[PDB]
Amino acid sequence: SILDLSKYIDKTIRVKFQGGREASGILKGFDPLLNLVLDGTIEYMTRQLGLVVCRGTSVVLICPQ
């Protein structure tokens, strides 16, 4: 993969999703398909979820925080 997600883990990231969703969370886990596991997940649509899993296939953009 072109992005080394290893650095990010235990770091707060900002992910845009296809369909106009923003999510900010703490990167707990990830895969080669770019599915993520986020912690303290807040979804800006304020919406608070917790430990979420984000489908890599709709993962549209990813920055830090």
Binding site: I2, L3, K16, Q18, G20, V59, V60, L61, C63, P64
Partner: protein, 74 residues
Amino acid sequence: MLPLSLLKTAQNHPMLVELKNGETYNGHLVSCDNWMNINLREVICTSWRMPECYIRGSTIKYLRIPDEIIDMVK
């Protein structure tokens, strides 16, 4: 030459990506794959300055290249 090859060798250049979303992204290019997923450094995004960004290929509309481009890769 092919889009992908062009990007592949435009590594280290500056470029401006339009998203399907309507978002403009100004950055220097760091990595490209065959899906056209991009990583950029020194980034500014317009509806925000960031260190690094990752962009899925399927969400790009078009990429403005620096005019240097042809001479820099080739």
